[PDB]
């Protein structure tokens, strides 16, 4: 943040001198000086470089909308005006509400003005920073000696070991320095929401529309214990969704709670699809309530807003029809939210308070804003205990909090501020759609296949586009209007494999492949499915990376037609088992894959499996103590019918759960059997494709074992 | 890691002019030549610098021994020789055992012997690295990019914004590129035990002398959590420590437990001594269970060891006589066991296997060790049941770990190895004991007041000093011999104001202000007694701060002694409140704050409160779960008799809970509220020095509040 | 009060190039190094050069008694010792009573002793400065702009104008920058004996043995008649 930028070259020495001696004054102050050669050239750099913290320009040459192009990207960023024939009558007042200072040309005088400019960058610096971080990073200026935990006392204690050393030298020493616990009392504590913290806390909360803001160092998982904790005491009832996070699976397994699965739908690729309205439904809760045993009135209700695939619900729906005091949005996929307009009604702190109720927000903060990982934000609208909450939420959260990740997470909150933030945002959106339109203007020139990206036909402008049953894109059937959404940020791609009545074609490419292929080159997808490849446009994502990912998948395209063999176009799966694929073209190998899901028929038997629940014989707490106590065995997967499973069976794909803790698989619920085994026998056909189906075991045998109460 | 040490001054061309050569080929590969002047020279610029690589020598000058000495201080440091005279039949095996490589002089050569040279640099620190954190370094190496979590994207988000850019260049971008997820599939999983992380996870348990090891990315709360979680079922007995962290409270509070407490002894300084033998034995044990309302047989036992005043437990005697199947030890301050001998047979991992038991160790890396805060270890020796384990590890572990923190927990294991980390530990420990000697000479010395040192009165060498009964050092009643024993690296120094019999003196400085002025003067103290002040003497401490406490403590007597204004010893405590602070000096204050603790009789009333066991008319958990439905309201201090507690009352001092959620305090226990309604009057008098109850909220009257069930 | 001086010429490696990197450091912070020959020259050069901030030496070639010796001379001068062979046994409380702080020899370590020493430099210059000196200081470093009295605005005035120049040139700009009145209220008021100027009396007073200290700024001339005039009223004798 020392980039200071001088415009304009006139030729009178009377200004050219003393903005030499300036320059001089300030490489003084270790500014680096920078020399733009015209007004577009200043507002490029400016543009393009972050670290710009001041722009000198020559009033006589450029008027005062200079600064207003300056402030539209920066309105914090430092404006110094030269000043030799305006006086203080050429100025407005909206001129005056820029961040302008204006000093004069003089021989002799660029001392004051170096240190002049030199405090203003100190101004912008401290504006712009959140309290908590500029609070570590004075800390760590202070260099004070310390004799408490962390114990390697700043980095010492690695730079006097050599491993230990090289260590250091690739963390550096601020990240070291800034190790600190609660010992250092200036910082305050995050347990106890005292000094800096307590600031950073409501900084948050104001920064995410929330009412009371919590951090959490252990990620949204620990975010939703602490949430469904503090509202679901044990004997409870709680409805939850059936495309929730293993977290709230442990949350149940860890609380004795009574789980009401919320039903969503899914299409042929087996992209998760949104609760249907009717499952919100006041009547349909009430049968459920009474078809299920020791099940009373919900006392809280969990929504996954947003999907993996990013499809959003129309939340003030949700908060009007729902009748549960406490509504939990697990929105770990969507933290920027409140920063777009384009999200408006679709996130839980959309709006005011709720008449009656409490709704609270679950973000990953380290999943689409920039933090470090395990960041993770708890928002809360409504009225809540503080003092039990808080309890819950020390029950949690360790006595020695990580300081780099809360002040990452505080920094985040920062960068959202301002036009800074704005552009920001706005800047990955409108990357993420140009690269939605190119996918699909390639697609269009492309004669034979090429990958196609799941969205509307005509995406223009930047909104979240609804998912209509008139349209087929999406692959619903009989979908509710101006209930789901699409977020624009989550791009999902897709390989040809399946055809628009959602029956698969005589050829396809197996998503997993490219992911393979583009791993090898240097690029690494968010996640894959049988046909489908998920790529996040969040604010990190460039021209640059998005340019080589249309790069690289043309390179794959290229490839493929050409029939490479596996060796060389993919070395590293070639490695894993090179006597199969030693003469193995990729051609071949995508068509056997190919071949076995089709023969297999998996996204029948997948959407099946997905589509009936397994009874519920005891909640998930019970099935793990019984499981704690050694009353379980491992029993094979035919034999799986009517024992009651002891182990939440999570596999990919779809990558969400299919039997909770407690559930027991019968007749009617054999479809699940039989997915699974197709799984297996699946996985077993190429050595760099295997059966992934957590809380299911390979045998040496190739046999796939459960464990179930016995 | 580009040091390269030419201990060379010869008075030849036909070597010197090589050497130069040798130089520049080295500069071009971008190592940095030092030049020792002699061989003692060379030892100490090894011992003083561990970013050194390599060492050159003359072999005609210097024979084999040099590296005999090299070796002594790091094993694996490379060494060259160059030959001139010597030949194959000068080396003996011993020679040939030592890390030497072997050159000749020739113009021309250099190229090819720095190319060795450095072959032989990047196999020095591959062997010195960890795997995972190798794997680590290597896949930032790569520079791939990323279309998944965390999203900042390698740092480019942060990159895109000032006051990101700001936090980038503090935290640097090593800090940013490490920091990704299980999408990248190389690296492995952290949850699954795969890849480089299961090898991490064999290196660790290799290191600690575990049977099986874990690591936690949430701290020994987490930990602790996670062992009692998997050893102790709803419904069951478990044997608690006491003296307790809070972690444990919340596991009770987390899970349907019974708890039946061992009861520690303490001193008249509050020091938190060990449980006596007899707590140990299997008929008090049985007693207390047959006393304990819906208590069975404890299926599981937790014991801090260490405590945080460095009280080890002689744990071969617990292993053999805790009659219970699962015994853990909370061993968060003792991570360096196994690491020195004089902690044999003082820690859980100590020794072998105990058959039909199960041991654990929760130890917090972060804590004494090297690694960033949050890391910390799981050691289990004997058998457990790992997919139930696993499952248990999973509860707690967020699906998104802080790469970097897994990754200085391997650095922490690695640190530890080999000759470097020997003189590491064993350093540290002589530093402790030279500081607390130059502690005992100063106190002799002195005319009047000094601080002492809490340990035996003739510490002279290198162990952990048993605590005898015939001693009265220690200041605990009827010790058991053999039993406990003092860590020499934790160092509590003892302020005036108590006397040898335990009551206190006529005049004391209470060891807070000495903190306060410590802070003032850039030192933090781990934490602070009444009249003690707790030192870490780590891995990371060295003879400059060592040296700088002593001259902060010569500067406080001084200063103390001269009675100055405390707007100047102390300008914090004054900014806190001027008024009240403008003319006091600081013997005044302290006199005060002794006088309000001898009026008020702290030690006794402390002592008496922390003797009495209140009545537990209901476990931690069934009083939070009614705590969790609204059925608590708040009642005043002195209304809490009859009453049952619905948060846990943690009051410091002594910092360790006095009353826990579902217990009520009686006639019996009466001595509690007295000590607790004397620390609220006590912390009302001076601006700086406020009570400390956790689990009690002050009012805007000034009363204390804590909150009952109704 | 930028001089350090650094007392050795060793002749081993590991100290002599962290000694070096220090000096590099040490002038990166705007220090000005000298390298005296022995103790007799370090002590002729402190007794000779007020301007000396703080002694560089090493413990193994010299005693803590050379810290005496220096103290004899300024006992707030800021020593530093490096350690290398002494520990923290080898110091007794009245050489702890000295104001020595002690570093170790380790390359990469200069940028911390550099800072470390700057930080003892800055606090050695407060404690001998007095408090309203001080204050005034400070806020000329705060280099504010005034609407009020003196007028020149801080020298502004006399730049504008040559002759005015030739006066600012001769007196420097602190004497007119320090040149401020009552408005700038941060400095207190003489005549109300407020703020900075209160502690300057008492300090006054402390240092000429006086229960009360007036400040004076029209000389003895106007001292003799304040004291006069309060202690002899019309009618006396
Ligand atoms: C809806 C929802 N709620 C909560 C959480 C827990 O949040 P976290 O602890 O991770 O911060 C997650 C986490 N999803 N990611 C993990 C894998 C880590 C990311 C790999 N690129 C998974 O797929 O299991 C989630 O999807
Ligand atoms: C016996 C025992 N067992 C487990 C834990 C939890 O370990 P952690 O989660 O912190 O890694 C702790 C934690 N003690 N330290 C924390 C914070 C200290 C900060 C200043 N140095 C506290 O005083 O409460 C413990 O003392
Ligand atoms: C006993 C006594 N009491 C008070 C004062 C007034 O003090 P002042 O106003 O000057 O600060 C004076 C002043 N004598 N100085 C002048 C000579 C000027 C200096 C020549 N080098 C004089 O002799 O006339 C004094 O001698």
């Given at each position: 943040?020392?980039?200071?930028?001088?415009?304009?070259?006139?030729?009178?020495?009377?200004?050219?001198?003393?903005?030499?001696?300036?320059?001089?004054?300030?490489?003084?102050?270790?500014?680096?000086?920078?020399?733009?050669?015209?007004?577009?050239?200043?507002?490029?750099?400016?543009?393009?470089?972050?670290?710009?913290?001041?722009?000198?320009?020559?009033?006589?040459?450029?008027?005062?909308?200079?600064?207003?192009?300056?402030?539209?990207?920066?309105?914090?960023?430092?404006?110094?005006?030269?000043?030799?024939?305006?006086?203080?009558?050429?100025?407005?007042?909206?001129?005056?509400?820029?961040?302008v200072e204006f000093f004069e040309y003089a021989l002799g005088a660029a001392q004051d003005i170096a240190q002049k400019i030199r405090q203003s960058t100190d101004a912008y610096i401290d504006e712009i920073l959140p309290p908590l971080t500029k609070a570590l990073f004075n800390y760590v200026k202070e260099g004070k000696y310390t004799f408490c935990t962390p114990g390697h006392m700043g980095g010492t204690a690695f730079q006097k070991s050599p491993v230990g050393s090289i260590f250091y030298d690739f963390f550096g020493a601020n990240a070291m320095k800034s190790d600190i616990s609660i010992s250092?009392?200036?910082?305050?504590?995050?347990?106890?929401?005292?000094?800096?913290?307590?600031?950073?806390?409501?900084?948050?909360?104001?920064?995410?529309?929330?009412?009371?803001?919590?951090?959490?160092?252990?990620?949204?998982?620990?975010?939703?214990?602490?949430?469904?904790?503090?509202?679901?005491?044990?004997?409870?009832?709680?409805?939850?969704?059936?495309?929730?996070?293993?977290?709230?699976?442990?949350?149940?397994?860890?609380?004795?709670?009574?789980?009401?699965?919320?039903?969503?739908?899914?299409?042929?690729?087996?992209?998760?699809?949104?609760?249907?309205?009717?499952?919100?439904?006041?009547?349909?809760?009430?049968?459920?309530?009474?078809?299920?045993?020791?099940?009373?009135?919900?006392?809280?209700?969990?929504?996954?807003?947003?999907?993996?695939?990013?499809?959003?619900?129309?939340?003030?729906?949700?908060?009007?029809?729902?009748?549960?005091?406490?509504?939990?949005?697990?929105?770990?996929?969507?933290?920027?939210?409140?920063?777009?307009?384009?999200?408006?009604?679709?996130?839980?702190?959309?709006?005011?308070?709720?008449?009656?109720?409490?709704?609270?927000?679950?973000?990953?903060?380290?999943?689409?804003?920039?933090?470090?990982?395990?960041?993770?934000?708890?928002?809360?609208?409504?009225?809540?205990?503080?003092?039990?909450?808080?309890?819950?939420?020390?029950?949690?959260?360790?006595?020695?909090?990580?300081?780099?990740?809360?002040?990452?997470?505080?920094?985040?909150?920062?960068?959202?501020?301002?036009?800074?933030?704005?552009?920001?945002?706005?800047?990955?959106?409108?990357?993420?759609?140009?690269?939605?339109?190119?996918?699909?203007?390639?697609?269009?020139?492309?004669?034979?296949?090429?990958?196609?990206?799941?969205?509307?036909?005509?995406?223009?402008?930047?909104?979240?586009?609804?998912?209509?049953?008139?349209?087929?894109?999406?692959?619903?059937?009989?979908?509710?209007?101006?209930?789901?959404?699409?977020?624009?940020?989550?791009?999902?791609?897709?390989?040809?494999?399946?055809?628009?009545?959602?029956?698969?074609?005589?050829?396809?490419?197996?998503?997993?492949?490219?992911?393979?292929?583009?791993?090898?080159?240097?690029?690494?997808?968010?996640?894959?499915?049988?046909?489908?490849?998920?790529?996040?446009?969040?604010?990190?994502?460039?021209?640059?990376?998005?340019?080589?990912?249309?790069?690289?998948?043309?390179?794959?395209?290229?490839?493929?037609?050409?029939?490479?063999?596996?060796?060389?176009?993919?070395?590293?799966?070639?490695?894993?088992?090179?006597?199969?694929?030693?003469?193995?073209?990729?051609?071949?190998?995508?068509?056997?894959?190919?071949?076995?899901?089709?023969?297999?028929?998996?996204?029948?038997?997948?959407?099946?499996?997905?589509?009936?629940?397994?009874?519920?014989?005891?909640?998930?707490?019970?099935?793990?103590?019984?499981?704690?106590?050694?009353?379980?065995?491992?029993?094979?997967?035919?034999?799986?019918?009517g024992k009651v499973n002891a182990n939440m069976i999570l596999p990919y794909p779809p990558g969400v759960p299919l039997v909770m803790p407690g559930e027991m698989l019968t007749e009617e619920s054999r479809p699940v059997l039989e997915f699974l085994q197709m799984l297996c026998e699946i996985g077993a056909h190429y050595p760099g494709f295997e059966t992934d189906i957590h809380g299911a075991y390979r045998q040496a045998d190739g046999r796939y074992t459960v464990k179930v109460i016995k």
């Open positions: 943040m020392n980039i200071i930028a001088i415009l304009n070259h006139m030729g009178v020495y009377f200004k050219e001198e003393p903005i030499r001696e300036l320059h001089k004054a300030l490489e003084a102050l270790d500014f680096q000086i920078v020399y733009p050669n015209d007004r577009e050239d200043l507002l490029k750099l400016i543009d393009n470089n972050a670290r710009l913290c001041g722009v000198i320009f020559d009033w006589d040459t450029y008027n005062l909308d200079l600064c207003e192009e300056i402030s539209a990207m920066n309105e914090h960023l430092p404006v110094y005006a030269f000043a030799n024939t305006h006086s203080t009558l050429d100025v407005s007042l909206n001129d005056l509400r820029l961040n250092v009392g200036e910082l305050g504590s995050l347990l106890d929401h005292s000094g800096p913290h307590k600031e950073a806390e409501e900084y948050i909360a104001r920064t995410f529309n929330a009412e009371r803001s919590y951090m959490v160092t252990n990620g949204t998982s620990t975010a939703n214990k602490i949430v469904g904790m503090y509202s679901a005491p044990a004997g409870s009832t709680v409805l939850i969704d059936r495309n929730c996070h293993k977290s709230l699976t442990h949350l149940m397994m860890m609380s004795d709670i009574t789980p009401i699965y919320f039903r969503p739908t899914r299409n042929a690729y087996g992209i998760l699809g949104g609760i249907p309205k009717s499952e919100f439904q006041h009547d349909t809760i009430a049968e459920r309530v009474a078809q299920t045993p020791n099940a009373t009135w919900p006392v809280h209700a969990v929504v996954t807003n947003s999907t993996y695939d990013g499809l959003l619900y129309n939340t003030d729906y949700i908060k009007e029809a729902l009748d549960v005091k406490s509504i939990h949005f697990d929105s770990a996929w969507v933290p920027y939210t409140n920063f777009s307009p384009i999200y408006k009604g679709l996130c839980g702190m959309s709006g005011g308070r709720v008449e009656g109720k409490v709704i609270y927000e679950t973000q990953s903060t380290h999943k689409l804003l920039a933090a470090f990982s395990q960041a993770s934000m708890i928002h809360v609208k409504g009225d809540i205990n503080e003092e039990t909450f808080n309890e819950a939420y020390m029950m949690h959260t360790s006595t020695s909090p990580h300081y780099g990740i809360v002040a990452s997470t505080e920094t985040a909150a920062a960068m959202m501020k301002g036009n800074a933030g704005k552009r920001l945002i706005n800047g990955s959106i409108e990357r993420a759609i140009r690269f939605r339109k190119e996918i699909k203007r390639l697609n269009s020139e492309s004669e034979g296949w090429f990958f196609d990206v799941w969205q509307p036909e005509g995406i223009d402008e930047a909104k979240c586009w609804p998912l209509d049953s008139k349209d087929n894109w999406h692959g619903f059937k009989d979908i509710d209007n101006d209930h789901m959404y699409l977020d624009p940020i989550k791009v999902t791609l897709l390989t040809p494999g399946m055809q628009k009545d959602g029956s698969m074609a005589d050829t396809g490419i197996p998503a997993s492949i490219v992911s393979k292929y583009l791993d090898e080159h240097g690029i690494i997808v968010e996640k894959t499915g049988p046909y489908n490849m998920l790529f996040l446009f969040s604010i990190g994502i460039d021209k640059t990376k998005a340019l080589s990912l249309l790069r690289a998948l043309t390179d794959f395209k290229r490839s493929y037609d050409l029939n490479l063999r596996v060796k060389n176009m993919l070395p590293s799966l070639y490695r894993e088992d090179p006597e199969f694929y030693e003469n193995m073209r990729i051609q071949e190998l995508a068509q056997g894959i190919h071949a076995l899901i089709q023969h297999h028929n998996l996204p029948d038997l997948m959407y099946r499996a997905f589509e009936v629940l397994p009874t519920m014989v005891m909640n998930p707490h019970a099935a793990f103590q019984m499981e704690l106590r050694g009353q379980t065995e491992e029993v094979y997967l035919e034999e799986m019918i």
